[PDB]
Amino acid sequence: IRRAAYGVVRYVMESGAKGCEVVVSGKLRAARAKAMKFADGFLIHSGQPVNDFIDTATRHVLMRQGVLGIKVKIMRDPAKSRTGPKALPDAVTIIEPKEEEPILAPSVKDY
Amino acid sequence: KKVYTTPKKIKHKHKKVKLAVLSYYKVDAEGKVTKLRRECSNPTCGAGVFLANHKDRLYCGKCHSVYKVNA
């Protein structure tokens, strides 16, 4: 239940995702229902960027013992956005100035 | 729940009987075959099928129901 989940997470992460999340709900071998979260990197859970970046799916895995949930959540690197906004609304970048060589009594050139 | 009341008296579906069937084609002697049990008049029935004999009754079975033919 870990080896599989953690395996997925590694492949998705290595596929360039900004982040991803794997949840398993159900019952394995123990009569009581338990659940695990598996998550790495970066994810936002709120706002419009939700629709924009994270992709989710749920899947019912039917087994001998019963049925488990697979909820998978993958977040995509907003830089690569192609068609859409290329960063979270969060992001604010200041452009970096350049060293100056001031003074220089005025003169002038000609053409 | 409740589990089984009932007033006895169950039912049975059908036997279909046994009936060695066609001994009915009457010969006379050797070898003429005079063919008892008259045959039906409708195109779906190719005269292979016949009519049953009851009181007031001549009935085609090949017609599951249709066409009472009375004589």
């Binding site: 080896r3 953690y6 395996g7 590694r10 492949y11 290595e14 | 008259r38 005269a47």
Partner: protein, 47 residues
């Protein structure tokens, strides 16, 4: 470790798949081909 290496083969199967490597008949018309006669008998209506 067994999960990380699990994704070693997921890359392998993914990287080796980036390159990697008539019964004429026609039963629609065969009933039209077999349409040939001497396939039946019809005679009836006595008495």
């Amino acid at each position: 470790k067994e999960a990380q290496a699990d994704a070693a083969a997921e890359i392998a199967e993914d990287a080796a798949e980036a390159e990697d490597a008539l019964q004429d008949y026609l039963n629609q018309q065969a009933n039209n081909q077999f349409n040939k006669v001497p396939e039946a008998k019809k005679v009836e209506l006595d008495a």
